Design a protein around this ligand. Structure first.
Ligand SMILES: N=C(N)c1ccc(OCc2cccc(COc3ccc(C(=N)N)cc3)n2)cc1
Length: 91
DNA sequence: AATAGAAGGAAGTGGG
DNA sequence: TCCCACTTCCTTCTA
């Protein structure tokens, strides 16, 4: 099963949910969620994982925060904005 | 207050 | 056994 950071990177590459997520500075790996359309993206994550309950953005962001230590994804001090690591981007 | 973003401890679930 | 990689629940805190 796909890892969350890869799910997000793949969405950004394909462009299939451009109203819910977008690059801010793609060279730096910074990206941002839509305030109004993030929940539809969270729902898609939960359905792709086959989880028991409906996925929410809050729960998806709780998972994102766990990457802070290992570094795959870090929180940017901007509303709804995060940053992929160079290692994640290279793959 | 209402709305909403952000944090994180802790317990539960998956698939090795 | 026991870590992976989250998921779920709840409370707190900040803007
Ligand atoms: N578990 C703890 N003890 C804990 C410790 C620290 C915490 O801090 C939370 C926090 C940190 C930084 C920034 C923010 C809020 O940011 C916002 C940005 C933009 C908007 C907007 N324009 N609508 C609204 C809010 N909230 C929370 C709980």
């Amino acid at each position: 099963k796909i890892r969350l950071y890869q799910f997000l990177l793949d969405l950004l590459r394909s462009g299939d949910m451009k109203d819910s997520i977008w690059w801010v500075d793609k060279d730096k790996g910074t990206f941002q969620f839509s305030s109004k359309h993030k929940e539809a993206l969270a729902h898609r994550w939960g359905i792709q994982k086959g989880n028991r309950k409906k996925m929410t953005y809050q729960k998806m962001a709780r998972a994102l925060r766990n990457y802070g230590k290992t570094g795959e994804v870090k929180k940017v001090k901007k509303k709804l904005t995060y940053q992929f690591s160079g290692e994640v981007l290279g793959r």
